[PDB]
Amino acid sequence: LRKVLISDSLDPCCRKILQDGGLQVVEKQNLSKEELIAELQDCEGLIVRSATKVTADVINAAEKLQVVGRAGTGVDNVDLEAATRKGILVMNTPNGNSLSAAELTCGMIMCLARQIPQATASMKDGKWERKKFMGTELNGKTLGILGLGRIGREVATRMQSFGMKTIGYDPIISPEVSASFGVQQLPLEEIWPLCDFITVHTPLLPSTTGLLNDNTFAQCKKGVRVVNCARGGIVDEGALLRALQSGQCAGAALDVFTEEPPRDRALVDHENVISCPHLGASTKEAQSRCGEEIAVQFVDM
Amino acid sequence: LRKVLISDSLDPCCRKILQDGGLQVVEKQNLSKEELIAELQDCEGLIVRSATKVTADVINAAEKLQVVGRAGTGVDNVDLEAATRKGILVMNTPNGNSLSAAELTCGMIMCLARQIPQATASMKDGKWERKKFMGTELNGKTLGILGLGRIGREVATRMQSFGMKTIGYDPIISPEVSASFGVQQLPLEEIWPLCDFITVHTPLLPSTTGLLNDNTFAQCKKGVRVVNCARGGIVDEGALLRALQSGQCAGAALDVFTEEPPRDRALVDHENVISCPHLGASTKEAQSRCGEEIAVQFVDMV
Numbered sequence: 086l087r088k089v090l091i092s093d094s095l096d097p098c099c100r101k102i103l104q105d106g107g108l109q110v111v112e113k114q115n116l117s118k119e120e121l122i123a124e125l126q127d128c129e130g131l132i133v134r135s136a137t138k139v140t141a142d143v144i145n146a147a148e149k150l151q152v153v154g155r156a157g158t159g160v161d162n163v164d165l166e167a168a169t170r171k172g173i174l175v176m177n178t179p180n181g182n183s184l185s186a187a188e189l190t191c192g193m194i195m196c197l198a199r200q201i202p203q204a205t206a207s208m209k210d211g212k213w214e215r216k217k218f219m220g221t222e223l224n225g226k227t228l229g230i231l232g233l234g235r236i237g238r239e240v241a242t243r244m245q246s247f248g249m250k251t252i253g254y255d256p257i258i259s260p261e262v263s264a265s266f267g268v269q270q271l272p273l274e275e276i277w278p279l280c281d282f283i284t285v286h287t288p289l290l291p292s293t294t295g296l297l298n299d300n301t302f303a304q305c306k307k308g309v310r311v312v313n314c315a316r317g318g319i320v321d322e323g324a325l326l327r328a329l330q331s332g333q334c335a336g337a338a339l340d341v342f343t344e345e346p347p348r349d350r351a352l353v354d355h356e357n358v359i360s361c362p363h364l365g366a367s368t369k370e371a372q373s374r375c376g377e378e379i380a381v382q383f384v385d386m
Numbered sequence: 387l388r389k390v391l392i393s394d395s396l397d398p399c400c401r402k403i404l405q406d407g408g409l410q411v412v413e414k415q416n417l418s419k420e421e422l423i424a425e426l427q428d429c430e431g432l433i434v435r436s437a438t439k440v441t442a443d444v445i446n447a448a449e450k451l452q453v454v455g456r457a458g459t460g461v462d463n464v465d466l467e468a469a470t471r472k473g474i475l476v477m478n479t480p481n482g483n484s485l486s487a488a489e490l491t492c493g494m495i496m497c498l499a500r501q502i503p504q505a506t507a508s509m510k511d512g513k514w515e516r517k518k519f520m521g522t523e524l525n526g527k528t529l530g531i532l533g534l535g536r537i538g539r540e541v542a543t544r545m546q547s548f549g550m551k552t553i554g555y556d557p558i559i560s561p562e563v564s565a566s567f568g569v570q571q572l573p574l575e576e577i578w579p580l581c582d583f584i585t586v587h588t589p590l591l592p593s594t595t596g597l598l599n600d601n602t603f604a605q606c607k608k609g610v611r612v613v614n615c616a617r618g619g620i621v622d623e624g625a626l627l628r629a630l631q632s633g634q635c636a637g638a639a640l641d642v643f644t645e646e647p648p649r650d651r652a653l654v655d656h657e658n659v660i661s662c663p664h665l666g667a668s669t670k671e672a673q674s675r676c677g678e679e680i681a682v683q684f685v686d687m688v
């Protein structure tokens with residue numbers, strides 16, 4: 086409402102937009118509990134990235150605190166329970182990470198078709214394995230996009246330039262909206278048998294937990310390739326492993342895991358699995374857009 | 387032309403089209419010099435991939451041989467001098483590989499921007515090194531395309547969808563024609579300092595041998611990423627290694643080498659290098675199209 090503390094490595098645009106909105110702001114970085122508490126004493130708002138841990142002790146000591154803003158998608162460094170007990174609103178910036186998440190997804194799709202990460206490891210091992218890494222063309226193949234928000238939409242328009250047929254489903258996004266970006270919506274039951282590739286771009290909710298499971302993998306065309314650059318849990322990990330074992334799934338690209346880092350290494354260790362350590366939001370550009378978005382949100386209220 | 391030997395593993399569509407054209411087809415693979423020569427005794431045509439070596443001794447022993455077709459790009463496995471000397475026509479199928487080559491190139495670009503082969507290796511080694519990785523967003527970045535034939539054009543239209551600024555140069559393709567597919571042509575010297583990424587799609591010629599060398603690498607902006615899915619030697623390997631070691635080049639993706647497989651391991655072993663064993667044409671679709679294209683050429687000859 087009046088004063089905000091930026092307590093992490095943020096792009097200068099964040100301070101600029103807050104001040105333009107009529108808010109006073111203090112910019113500091115890597116503070117200790119007491120240092121953080123002292124600065125927060127006359128602040129209604131708090132802006133963090135990944136370094137600052139917003140624990141119960143910090144929350145309870147900041148009596149004027151009303152909003153905790155995280156410049157990014159995930160809110161693991163913030164005690165959600167302590168904030169909710171105190172009536173503090175916890176905000177994130179999902180839009181800022183959209184482009185980098187969509188780009189990584191497209192890169193993963195290209196990696197599943199041509200096994201570039203596996204071919205690199207092979208080359209680095211002094212091997213020259215041509216027959217093994219015989220791949221597939223993307224042109225003319227069907228891409229099923231489950232979740233048609235900003236990320237799903239950006240993935241669709243990029244893969245359409247490769248001549249992929251983009252189909253999908255989203256219960257929030259209308260068929261008219263998805264048709265404007267060339268995505269034909271079909272009932273979920275009808276999507277599984279048509280896809281050569283399937284990508285998920287939904288939030289993690291009870292309705293989206295295990296969207297790809299033993300039953301849906303069995304409805305897929307044999308040799309389907311799957312991408313999960315959204316959130317760990319949307320693809321049932323045990324069902325994905327069984328599908329890769331039988332060959333029902335020809336390959337998977339995972340940027341997210343139900344447990345991070347995953348203690349069960351069976352998926353990561355599978356030869357047909359490509360993975361990243363949650364790098365979807367890991368670009369200087371996404372970080373700047375999240376810094377900008379959080380300042381825009383704070384001004385709006 | 388009456389009998390054709392297919393001496394490498396080809397798509398069944400090749401044999402099927404040749405037979406539709408009235409030709410007798412024999413399909414064999416992994417034949418030795420002696421075995422290949424014996425099969426060709428009653429053959430007017432020979433279809434190869436890259437494993438069959440059409441040497442001077444093979445050409446000279448195959449007295450009925452009229453045509454040698456390669457289901458793919460180039461003819462490095464065919465003795466072009468011996469074929470020209472004995473009046474033997476040599477055919478290939480470069481158009482059959484274009485989409486697959488352009489798709490691999492785009493995959494290489496995305497792999498360099500987000501260090502995907504490195505992240506996979508780190509994960510497979512049982513590590514969670516998120517803090518050690520920082521990628522680059524392609525949107526608004528400049529991609530320089532040297533050579534604007536079929537492959538260069540296909541790379542451009544796909545990377546345009548990522549919001550990349552596509553500039554380039556080709557002495558044969560007019561700036562008006564490249565503008566129609568969104569590639570802004572500028573004098574070669576103006577291209578180097580503008581690119582975040584450079585990809586080569588030219589034939590290997592005296593003018594293109596070492597197109598990227600110590601002189602042109604110095605002209606590039608610090609941290610440039612380079613892709614070579616065209617021909618080994620267009621990017622000077624020695625100059626690329628020095629640029630990688632200095633940081634002038636932030637990363638390189640190589641499908642092709644001056645020597646295949648490469649005995650010099652300096653580039654392949656570099657942490658910022660991603661590579662493939664010449665996989666540009668390695669798709670079920672590209673192999674099927676090349677087999678189809680060479681069969682149509684043989685049937686057109688009869």
Ligand SMILES: C[C@@H](NC(=O)c1cc(-c2ccccc2)nn1C)c1ccc(C(=O)NS(C)(=O)=O)cc1
Nearest residue numbers: 179231232233234236254255256257258286287288
């Ligand atoms: C547009 C909206 N769609 C949905 O919410 C949605 C989609 C599905 C669904 C279920 C089954 C099959 C296919 C789709 N179910 N639901 C509840 C959406 C919202 C946020 C993100 C997002 O990416 N969030 S983020 C940046 O925080 O990860 C993405 C999309």
Ligand SMILES: C[C@@H](NC(=O)c1cc(-c2ccccc2)nn1C)c1ccc(C(=O)NS(C)(=O)=O)cc1
Nearest residue numbers: 459480532533534535555556557558587588589594
């Ligand atoms: C369009 C044409 N361009 C040229 O020939 C050309 C380009 C350059 C050049 C030199 C310096 C800097 C930038 C470009 N110089 N020249 C003579 C071309 C023809 C075939 C391929 C091909 O790839 N063929 S293939 C599938 O059989 O390998 C590719 C392109």
